[PDB]
Amino acid sequence: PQITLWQRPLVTIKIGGQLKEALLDTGADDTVLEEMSLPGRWKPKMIGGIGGFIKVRQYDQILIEICGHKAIGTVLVGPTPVNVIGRNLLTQIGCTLNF
């Protein structure tokens, strides 16, 4: 698809058997989602932006489906105010910026 930026580029995703709304965010190095359970190992990380930092759990090799595409990547889980899909997974679906 070609997605306009007149509005926030929100997509639905499936992860953990769960459906979630998320922002396609080229500014985010990694995908960050609100508190949820995920399988496997993880490690603690601090991520930050305007307003400061939050602590997240970093899970790797997580299966996610996005716009009918299945991708594998890192998911940061923690108290974010906005779920975003970061570059780490946008590359896997072949997403590019164009003007």
Nearer to ligand G4G (CB atom), residue 39 or residue 49: 49
Q: Answer yes or no whether residue 83 interacts with Cl ion by CB under 5 A.
A: no
Q: Answer yes or no whether residue 44 interacts with a second copy by CB under 8 A.
A: no
Distance (Å, whole) CA 77 – CA 8: 21
Q: Answer yes or no whether residue 49 interacts with a second copy by CB under 8 A.
A: yes
Structure tokens at 23: 């922002």
Site map 53..72 versus ligand G4G, x via CB under 6 A: --------------------
For residue 71, what are the β-bridge partners? 64
